[PDB]
Design a protein around this ligand. Structure first.
Ligand SMILES: CCCCCCCCCCCCCCCCCC(=O)OC[C@H](COP(=O)([O-])OCC(O)COP(=O)([O-])OC[C@@H](COC(=O)CCCCCCCCCCCCCCCCC)OC(=O)CCCCCCCCCCCCCCCCC)OC(=O)CCCCCCCCCCCCCCCCC
Ligand SMILES: CCCCCCCCCCCCCCCCCC(=O)OC[C@H](COP(=O)([O-])OCC(O)COP(=O)([O-])OC[C@@H](COC(=O)CCCCCCCCCCCCCCCCC)OC(=O)CCCCCCCCCCCCCCCCC)OC(=O)CCCCCCCCCCCCCCCCC
Ligand SMILES: CCCCCCCCCCCCCCCCCC(=O)OC[C@H](COP(=O)([O-])OCC(O)COP(=O)([O-])OC[C@@H](COC(=O)CCCCCCCCCCCCCCCCC)OC(=O)CCCCCCCCCCCCCCCCC)OC(=O)CCCCCCCCCCCCCCCCC
Ligand SMILES: CCCCCCCCCCCCCCCCCC(=O)OC[C@H](COP(=O)([O-])OCC[N+](C)(C)C)OC(=O)CCCCCCCCCCCCCCCCC
Ligand SMILES: CCCCCCCCCCCCCCCCCC(=O)OC[C@H](COP(=O)(O)OCCN)OC(=O)CCCCCCCCCCCCCCCCC
Ligand SMILES: CCCCCCCCCCCCCCCCCC(=O)OC[C@H](COP(=O)(O)OCCN)OC(=O)CCCCCCCCCCCCCCCCC
Ligand SMILES: CCCCCCCCCCCCCCCCCC(=O)OC[C@H](COP(=O)(O)OCCN)OC(=O)CCCCCCCCCCCCCCCCC
Ligand SMILES: CCCCCCCCCCCCCCCCCC(=O)OC[C@H](COP(=O)(O)OCCN)OC(=O)CCCCCCCCCCCCCCCCC
Ligand SMILES: CCCCCCCCCCCCCCCCCC(=O)OC[C@H](COP(=O)(O)OCCN)OC(=O)CCCCCCCCCCCCCCCCC
Ligand SMILES: Nc1ncnc2c1ncn2[C@@H]1O[C@H](COP(=O)(O)O)[C@@H](O)[C@H]1O
Lengths: 98, 52, 51, 347, 175, 120, 140, 320, 49, 55
């Protein structure tokens, strides 16, 4: 397939491994979730504009909606980390180990 | 469990975005309209195992 | 079956509610100092803002 | 929580699962999973303690990662097929990514690492919703895409799930982690017969939902979160010890109890396809699940651990809980095996 | 090399992804994600989707402004990591950059490459259509069909947003 | 397995051609077993709520039994329907493909040579 | 590692002991690297030096198991002149079990791993002989 | 059932009936503070429902015919045996204190159910926020161990955090000498064997730990003994307090709905009184609990649920 | 008159008893009506009269 | 020797100790999100490169 899909799928894998390897810091991985949604947006929109399949051009917009509609959820799940604990460090999320 | 409610009730929720050959706004064809239409009309009702 | 690693694991509480661990909230200390257009020349408000 | 808001949120969980079940479009599948996750997060945070925040954080990270992989599988389907029909997939890379995504949504091993933590963090009713109702939408997607599911991948996930969920429950005294590792083992059991006969997959899903709902309903009706508090049940209402005895002997796979039904029927469809080693190893690995079920029956019904004095007050108050469908679920989870050819209603 | 302009914008895109995937700090994570989201709307605009690129630009601008506010209020340490304050940031930053330019070199020397899929090395201008879309851009008509055709999609998206507000207010209550 | 048979008439619990089959009797032992499951459900419901098990709520026991019989009757109808669909598709497929189901020429035991293995 | 197993099995037993020993060594090394990867995944070592020490220890343990397994199996097939005979892999699995017990510095794990790995390698040889399917393709 | 989420949705909000007479008031003081009738007097002028102090047999007085059960069925504890031998070998001290804490928890749940259903304020005597002071005296006089205090603190930590404090706490200043005089004039031979340091420790944890930690979350009305004999003084001061402290102000319909749901299920109230912490004072063995439970089932009106017993005259069982 | 607090299941909920009995009677008579229609349909589609 | 120790050893006690050992090693987890998702990464990279499950 085309040259640009190499780098867009590569950007998906880079944001994947950025999400999938934590650095004791939760906002920086919520950013990687948002980046994975960005890469999925760009890849699907490149394919839909390539095909001239116009009716699923509303598909990435809807996609984009649920992007923030989960990512804001992460932010609302971030403050509950940061009101209980001092920071959002994921090593404070180990109380369910016993 | 594909509870096929849309064929049971006859309502049309998402049979329209499903393929490129469907009813498009202002009758816009895709670049692969004829190829997809020929493969869909080839493989209709003959099952996956025979269709592939 | 307690091993060496799984030995400091105390059992979780009965109501599944943990103590609140009241670490310092760190109210940001603003120095609304004397050189200010609102503090009339000579007024050092050392204030503790919660945001 | 407001009861109106609780009704709205539970109807939205059910709406997301129904959208995954009934829809013909991949974007609608992904919308159903997003709606299900978004609506179920306040069910996990029903009481607002740090354990619920940690459980909801781990669950959100796992299901969001799985939703990413699911949408990448959908986009590679869109590339290599030009369409959106929820059917078989047209590329093994997309099938691998979608199988990984659904294994993370089910908590199958080696992606099992969130189910005991999330299950231990949240209360018993939300854990019941997690371990029964959430195991319906990805199994619908696995039922719908099975001409493209790789054989070695789903069998590896299945038997590794059975072994890891067997060894997980043997070191547990909290009942919720017991039921969670039991869930990992039984999802391995469900997905093992998927590419051979998925009607048996649906049968095992139904019987596991009935048995798991029976166990969580008994846990709520006796207000038990630990093994040692389940062991005080003989001093309070001794019929509940009989019910947990028959249900935990049912879940282990002993006849004439109905939990012998799926497993045997699974073997009944795996040996027809000339697989003998794999159902043998699965059946021998199920003895671990039966072992920690025997541990719980030794704690609760077969012995009498020394209770405390204040039990003498709880004799003077009978249970006024709304035990929803508990005798019906107990009868269906213990006495259904002579009705084993009823499974043709799932065909 | 000007015919490869979507390719060069996509190299800047993956460099932004290396920027916020190494995770120095969510300030610079937001920096790299704004850079990547501002070149993604240049990647996708050369295919014709100007509306559908301006929106992924605008939504992610609002997103990074909100994420800025939260990481200044919650995810804040004393010495923020730029890219070089921690070696575990800088090492995988340089690693992602060198591997991205490595697969640039392996695709412009051969004009094909194969990581998992097989990719062409010619510029993606070659695959466009040779026709004109009349008095409408087709992506605008397709996104305008979200109301006339996509009724069920509207219903489930608006219901998800309504209960998303309900969910977020029930989580951030505590009692 | 048979999902392509119920792919033209979706979500019909009992189709139109299900009524060509004889219904389960009222004295069907499968249906009677489900009625005994209803009796067991009523007795467990009286036991776990500290009611006298055989006496309290004869209407409640009776609605348990009646509800299990009323669901299990239609479940047995769908069971017998889907096994009839199984046999009908089996027989029509054997009838349509004769070369893959050869009539075996049964040799009698006077021609059939079996090796005798003695126990000694 | 689908083709590591193929380049192990595609050579006749008792013919070229060096390449069979190297193939079983590489299979054991790949398995040890997988165990090492999950070991540094789930349990964080104290440092990178301790991490690569654990990785090298598990990798060399499993590679010694694979090496002594392939060596003992092919040498037994040569000295007994019976290739299609799972007693060869019983002896090879016992040698691998003694190898594991030597590396883990315990005779009891060595004897237990002798018995169970000999039974396992015998069963793998029987599955190669009769064509036993472990991940069987669905036919009905 | 009667009350639940369905009756809450259809219109029954509990702040519709929450008036300024709906105030939960708990009267405190030493053993012979003279509060025993004073609280009833505080209940009789404001029209509040008086709850007497929950002894061993409060739960026996709520269920059945209201008569007390025998002491082997409820408690396995004796107050006079605690007075005669406080340092007993069997450990009746902490077992008695645990049963008293359970009975006070049930009494406080009855107070909240009455306050949230009937909309009427309830007069208590020594609610669960004032139980621990006796425990503290029993640790200071060496009557119980430290593991007994740890068991009580665990039970208290998981139970009392689910409940609200009273509105008005009425303490009575009576020193040790007048308590001794009223016990000597009281006429109970077992009650006279109380040591003076025990009453001193009770007054110390009254005035040093209880009343300081309550004053943030309620409003104390501390009086002496002679003005406790004039209850119109006390009602006269209750009618003019400005309730601005405590967590009763930030109470909408939803929080009090979840409170009324938690309160009306008495086994969920008593869920953490019998926690599985094996302590030799509260742990009854297997065969003894078997014997006592089988004897409890054979009691008149105790074999089944409260409307399903032929022996005490429950008709129409076959239609219930 | 025994119980000091009037139990909720002291008097039978006659509305609930009536709904229980009416629902069970309707399930039986609709089951018999469906069975009679099914045996008529089976004897009609084949002609076993 | 045999029927109190060695026949008692070879089938049930060695199996019991092996299953106890594996039960302790599986459930000895520190509950960290970082190590769990790092193991997910290692699983996906073994599935692609080392097992060819995308073929
Ligand atoms: C019938 C079966 C279901 C019975 C459920 C209710 C049981 C019960 O409570 O009984 C008490 C009651 C007598 O007690 P009671 O004096 O009334 O008061 C209750 C006591 O106070 C009770 O005392 P308590 O509750 O205060 O505490 C004492 C405690 C004592 O317990 C303890 O102290 C602890 C436990 C002791 C050790 C464990 C013992 C074993 C327990 C488990 C059972 C294992 C075997 C089952 C199979 C294996 C499963 C693992 O519990 C009991 O005594 C309860 C007895 C339970 C016995 C039955 C249990 C039912 C569930 C399990 C069996 C069914 C499912 C599995 C079957 C699978 C297939 C074979 O017994 C009965 O009524 C039995 C039924 C007798 C009449 C039968 C009539 C049949 C008529 C047939 C024709 C008409 C119908 C036509 C239908 C079709 C129409 C179309
Ligand atoms: C079509 C698919 C239908 C699937 C089953 C539908 C019913 C069960 C699921 C719905 C549910 O949650 O029901 C709650 C459930 C009671 O929940 P619970 O916690 O078990 O009740 C404890 C006591 O019964 C508490 O008693 P109570 O104080 O509320 O008063 C007596 C109460 C009074 O209730 C009434 O009078 C309700 C009247 C109106 C009913 C709804 C119409 C509007 O009657 C009952 O509770 C009778 C027993 C209920 C049995 C529920 C299960 C029925 C059978 C489920 C299928 C089993 C299949 C086995 C197959 C085996 C072989 C594979 O049932 C009802 O409230 C009414 C049941 C009506 C059954 C109709 C069956 C045919 C439907 C067509
Ligand atoms: C498998 C091989 C063994 C691996 C696990 C052994 C236990 C853990 C261990 O090593 O702990 C020590 C050590 C540290 O543990 P620890 O905390 O010190 O605990 C040990 C104690 O200190 C005390 O250590 P100790 O050495 O003094 O005493 C331990 C005891 C030493 O044994 C004795 O003291 C007496 C037993 C003598 C040897 C056993 C004789 C068996 C005879 C044959 C069986 C009966 C056949 C009858 C019929 C004949 C005809 C068929 O050995 C065992 O308990 C081993 C149990 C057998 C393991 C396999 C059981 C599978 C059953 C599956 C169902 C069937 O851990 C390690 O070294 C970790 C690495 C272990 C090996 C990694 C995996 C290697 C996999 C190789 C390929 C396997 C293929 C699949 C085979 C299994 C499925 C079919
Ligand atoms: C009590 C302690 C000891 C217990 C011993 C129990 C028995 C030991 C042997 C069991 C073997 C497994 C079941 C075999 C079923 C054979 C059915 C069949 O069709 O076979 C032909 C089939 C052949 O396949 P097929 O028949 O489909 O193919 C057609 C035939 N050919 C091959 C010619 C093309 O055999 C197999 O598939 C393999 C059978 C052996 C599998 C071995 C795995 C288990 C290893 C040992 C387990 C020991 C007990 C485990 C529990 C111990 C305690 C925890
Ligand atoms: C380190 C931090 C960063 C520091 C440096 C910051 C530099 C400044 C960044 C700000 C500017 C960002 C611009 C992003 C793209 C904007 C797209 C745009 O201008 O769209 C407007 C217009 C839409 O009209 P259209 O419908 O396309 O009409 C053509 C048909 N008649 O579209 C057109 O008319 C299309 C004309 C051609 C467009 C060329 C392709 C886009 C080029 C993108 C360059 C890179 C942008 C980087 C953004 C980083 C943001 C921080
Ligand atoms: C209690 C069950 C109540 C069922 C009421 C009727 C619901 C209905 O119409 O179900 C239709 C469904 C068959 O629909 P079908 O298109 O065959 O779906 C097969 C999935 N691939 O029928 C079924 O799925 C029947 C089996 C459901 C069993 C559920 C309880 C066990
Ligand atoms: C061989 C060998 O070394 O056996 C001794 C070993 C313990 O060795 P150690 O005492 O540590 O020196 O002991 C072991 O390794 C445990 C036993 C080794 C295998 C014994 C096989 C026979 C078992 C009895 C069978 C009865 C029938
Ligand atoms: C108790 C445990 C019992 C285990 C029984 C295993 C029986 C053998 C099944 C797998 C096996 O080795 O089969 C032999 C087969 C080689 O023969 P073939 O089928 O021709 O493979 C070429 C594929 N086109 O090879 C294959 O099918 C693939 C090779 C599988 C190797 C399995 C052993 C791995 C290492 C030990 C674990
Ligand atoms: C022929 C078959 C031989 C093997 C049969 C199964 C194992 C042996 C029998 C069961 C275990 C016997 C026993 O006594 O185990 C007890 C032991 C310790 O259990 P614990 O919870 O500490 O008990 C309290 C004090 N005893 O518990 C353990 O060590 C736990 C062992 C659990 C093993 C369950 C069975 C697994 C079978 C499949 C393996 C694959
Ligand atoms: N927690 C407790 N510990 C010891 N004695 C108590 C406790 N609660 C109540 N009492 C007794 O209850 C009685 C209250 O005194 P009076 O108000 O005169 O009935 C005295 O006999 C007290 O000793």
């Amino acid at each position: 397939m085309s040259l640009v899909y190499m780098n867009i799928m590569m950007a998906f894998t880079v944001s994947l491994t950025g999400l999938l390897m934590y650095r004791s810091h939760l906002m920086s991985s919520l950013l990687c979730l948002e980046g994975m949604m960005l890469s999925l947006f760009i890849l699907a929109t490149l394919m839909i504009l390539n095909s001239h399949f116009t009716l699923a051009s509303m598909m990435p917009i809807i996609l984009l909606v649920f992007a923030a509609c989960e990512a804001a959820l992460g932010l609302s799940l971030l403050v509950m980390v940061s009101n209980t604990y001092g920071t959002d460090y994921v090593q404070n999320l180990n109380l369910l180990q016993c | 469990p594909f509870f096929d409610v849309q064929k049971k009730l006859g309502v049309d929720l998402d049979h329209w975005m499903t393929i490129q050959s469907a009813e498009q706004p202002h009758r816009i064809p895709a670049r692969c309209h004829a190829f997809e239409k020929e493969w869909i009309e080839c493989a209709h009702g003959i099952g996956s195992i025979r269709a592939e | 079956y307690p091993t060496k690693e799984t030995a400091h694991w105390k059992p979780p509480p009965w109501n599944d509610v943990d103590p609140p661990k009241d670490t310092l909230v760190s109210n940001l200390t603003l120095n609304f100092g004397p050189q200010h257009p609102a503090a009339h020349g000579v007024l050092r408000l050392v204030m503790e803002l919660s945001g | 929580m407001n009861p109106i808001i609780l009704i709205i949120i539970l109807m939205t969980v059910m709406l997301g699962t129904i959208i995954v079940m009934i829809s013909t479009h991949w974007l609608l599948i992904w919308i159903g999973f997003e709606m299900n996750m978004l609506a179920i997060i306040p069910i996990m945070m029903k009481k607002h303690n740090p354990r619920a925040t940690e459980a909801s954080t781990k669950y959100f990270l796992t299901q969001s990662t799985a939703s990413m992989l699911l949408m990448m599988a959908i986009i590679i389907n869109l590339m290599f097929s030009g369409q959106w029909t929820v059917m078989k997939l047209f590329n093994p890379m997309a099938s691998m990514l979608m199988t990984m995504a659904l294994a993370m949504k089910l908590g199958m091993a080696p992606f099992h690492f969130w189910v005991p933590e999330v299950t231990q963090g949240i209360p018993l009713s939300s854990g019941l919703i997690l371990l029964t109702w959430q195991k319906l939408a990805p199994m619908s997607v696995l039922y719908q895409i099975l001409p493209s599911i790789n054989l070695d991948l789903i069998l590896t996930l299945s038997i590794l799930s059975i072994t890891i969920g067997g060894w997980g429950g043997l070191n547990q005294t909290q009942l919720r982690k017991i039921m969670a590792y039991s869930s990992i083992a039984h999802m391995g059991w469900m997905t093992a017969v998927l590419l051979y006969n998925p009607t048996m997959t649906l049968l095992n899903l139904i019987i596991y939902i009935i048995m798991t709902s029976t166990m969580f309903t008994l846990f709520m009706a006796n207000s038990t979160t630990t093994t040692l508090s389940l062991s005080h049940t003989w001093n309070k209402a001794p019929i509940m010890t009989i019910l947990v005895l028959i249900t935990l002997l049912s879940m282990g796979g002993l006849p004439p109890l109905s939990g012998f039904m799926p497993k045997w029927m699974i073997i009944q469809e795996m040996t027809k396809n000339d697989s003998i080693i794999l159902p043998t190893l699965m059946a021998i690995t199920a003895l671990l699940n039966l072992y920690f079920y025997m541990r719980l029956t030794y704690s609760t019904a077969l012995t009498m651990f020394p209770s405390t004095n204040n039990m003498k007050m709880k004799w003077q108050f009978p249970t006024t809980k709304r035990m929803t469908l508990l005798p019906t679920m107990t009868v269906l989870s213990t006495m259904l095996l002579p009705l084993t050819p009823i499974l043709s209603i799932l065909e | 090399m000007m015919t490869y302009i979507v390719f060069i914008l996509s190299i800047i895109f993956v460099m932004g992804f290396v920027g916020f995937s190494s995770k120095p700090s969510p300030i610079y994570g937001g920096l790299g994600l704004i850079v990547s989201g501002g070149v993604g709307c240049g990647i996708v605009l050369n295919f014709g989707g100007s509306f559908l690129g301006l929106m992924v630009f605008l939504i992610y601008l609002g997103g990074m402004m909100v994420v800025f506010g939260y990481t200044t209020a919650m995810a804040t340490e004393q010495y923020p990591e730029v890219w070089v304050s921690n070696k575990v940031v800088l090492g995988t930053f340089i690693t992602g950059l060198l591997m991205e330019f490595l697969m640039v070199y392996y695709v412009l020397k051969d004009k094909e490459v194969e990581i998992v899929f097989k990719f062409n090395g010619m510029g993606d201008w070659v695959i466009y259509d040779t026709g004109d879309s009349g008095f409408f851009s087709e992506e605008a008509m397709g996104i305008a069909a979200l109301y006339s055709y996509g009724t069920w999609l509207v219903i489930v998206t608006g219901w998800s947003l309504l209960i998303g507000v309900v969910v977020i207010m029930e989580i951030t209550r505590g009692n | 397995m048979m999902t392509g048979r119920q792919a033209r008439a979706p979500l019909q619990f009992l189709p139109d051609e299900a009524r060509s089959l004889p219904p389960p009797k009222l004295t069907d032992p499968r249906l009677a077993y489900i009625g005994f499951l209803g009796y067991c459900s009523g007795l467990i419901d009286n036991a776990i709520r500290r009611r006298p098990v055989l006496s309290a709520g004869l209407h409640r026991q009776f609605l348990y039994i009646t509800s299990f019989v009323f669901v299990g009757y239609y479940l047995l109808k769908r069971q017998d329907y889907m096994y009839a669909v199984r046999d009908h598709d089996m027989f029509s497929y054997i009838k349509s493909h004769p070369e893959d189901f050869p009539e075996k020429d049964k040799k009698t035991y006077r021609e059939v040579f079996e090796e005798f293995h003695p126990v000694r | 590692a689908k083709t590591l197993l193929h380049q192990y099995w595609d050579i006749p037993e008792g013919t070229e002991c060096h390449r069979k020993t190297y193939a079983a060594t590489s299979i054991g090394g790949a398995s040890g690297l997988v165990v090492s990867a999950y070991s540094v995944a789930l349990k964080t070592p104290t440092s990178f030096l301790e991490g690569v020490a654990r990785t090298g220890r598990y990798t060399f343990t499993a590679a010694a198991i694979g090496a002594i397994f392939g060596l003992t199996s092919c040498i037994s097939a040569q000295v007994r002149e019976k290739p299609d005979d799972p007693l060869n892999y019983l002896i090879g699995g016992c040698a691998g079990g003694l190898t594991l017990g030597a590396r883990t510095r315990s005779y009891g794990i060595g004897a237990a791993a002798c018995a169970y790995m000999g039974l396992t390698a015998a069963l793998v040889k029987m599955g190669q002989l009769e064509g036993w399917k472990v991940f069987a393709e669905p036919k009905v | 059932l009667q009350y639940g989420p369905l009756a809450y949705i259809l219109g029954e909000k509990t702040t519709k009936k929450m008036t300024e007479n709906s105030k939960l008031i708990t009267v405190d003081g030493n053993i012979c503070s003279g509060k025993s009738k004073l609280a009833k007097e505080v209940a009789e002028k404001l029209g509040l429902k008086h709850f007497p102090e929950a002894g061993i047999h409060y739960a026996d007085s709520t269920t059945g015919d209201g008569k007390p059960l025998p002491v082997r069925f409820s408690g396995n504890c004796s107050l006079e045996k605690f007075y005669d031998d406080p340092k007993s070998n069997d450990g009746n001290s902490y077992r008695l204190q645990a049963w008293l804490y359970a009975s006070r928890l049930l009494q406080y749940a009855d107070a909240l159910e009455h306050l949230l259903s009937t909309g009427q304020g309830v007069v208590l005597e020594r609610s669960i926020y004032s139980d621990f002071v006796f425990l503290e005296a029993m640790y200071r006089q060496g009557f119980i161990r430290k593991q007994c205090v740890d068991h009580y603190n665990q039970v208290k930590k998981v139970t009392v955090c689910e409940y609200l404090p009273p509105h008005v706490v009425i303490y009575v200043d009576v020193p040790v000498s007048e308590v001794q005089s009223r016990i000597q004039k009281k006429g109970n031979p077992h009650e006279m064997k109380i040591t003076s340091a025990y009453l001193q420790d009770i007054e110390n944890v009254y005035k040093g730990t209880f009343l300081p930690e309550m004053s943030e979350k309620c409003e104390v009305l501390q009086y002496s003994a002679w003005e406790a004999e004039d209850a119109e003084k006390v009602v006269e001061d209750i009618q003019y307090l400005k309730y601005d402290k405590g967590p009763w102000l930030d109470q909408d319909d939803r929080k009090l709905h979840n409170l009324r749901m938690l309160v009306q299920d008495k086994l969920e109230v008593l869920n953490y009184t019998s926690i599985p912490v094996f302590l030799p004072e509260v742990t009854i063995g297997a065969h003894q609990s078997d014997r006592v439970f089988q004897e409890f089932t054979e009691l008149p009106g105790r074999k089944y649920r409260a409307g399903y017993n032929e022996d005490v005259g429950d008709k129409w069982i076959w239609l219930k | 008159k025994f119980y000091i607090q009037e139990p909720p299941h002291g008097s039978p909920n006659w509305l609930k008893v009536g709904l229980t009995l009416g629902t069970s009677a309707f399930l039986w008579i609709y089951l018999i009506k469906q069975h009679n229609e099914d045996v008529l349909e089976y004897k009609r589609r084949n002609g076993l009269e | 020797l045999l029927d109190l120790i060695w026949l008692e050893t070879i089938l049930p006690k060695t199996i019991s100790l092996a299953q106890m050992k594996m039960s302790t090693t599986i459930t000895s987890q520190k509950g960290l999100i970082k190590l769990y998702f790092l193991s997910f990464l290692i699983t996906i990279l073994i599935s692609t490169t080392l097992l060819n499950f995308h073929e």
